[PDB]
Design a protein around this ligand. Sequence first.
Ligand SMILES: [Mg+2]
Ligand SMILES: [Mg+2]
Ligand SMILES: [Mg+2]
Length: 70
Amino acid sequence: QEEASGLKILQEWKYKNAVISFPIKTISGRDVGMEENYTVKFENDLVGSDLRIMQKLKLGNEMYFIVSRL
RNA sequence: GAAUACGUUCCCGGGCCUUGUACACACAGCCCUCACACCAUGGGAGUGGGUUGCAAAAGAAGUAGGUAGCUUAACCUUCG
Ligand SMILES: [Mg+2]
Ligand SMILES: [Mg+2]
Ligand SMILES: [Mg+2]
């Protein structure tokens, strides 16, 4: 819906934690890049506000995210 | 050491020929996946003038006109 506008929603819904996953169906080094961006848009953009991270996994076909706020 | 193919519609492989083709190493052709950057174009709240047009107001210099104030060497002086 917009270019680089993800950090907005979590905050709007006043909260504490979450769980956020994505597909990891990289076909033996094919979907690399075209599927490894649901992440690098986090760690990069996640310095500055009340948002933080708790844990991270990558098994099966879904990589769940755990988030924290103060 | 002998009971003895009635028959070639049939990709061990080739010739004659025909239409195409998403063909020239030369035969076959209807997405499942994405924040997509960054240079080029089409826009585009407002800003701003250029050059100003338009409804006017005000009008510096100069040029011209009027003019009872004021002032003055050549001319006429009647001589006021
Ligand atoms: Mg053949
Ligand atoms: Mg003008
Ligand atoms: Mg004058």
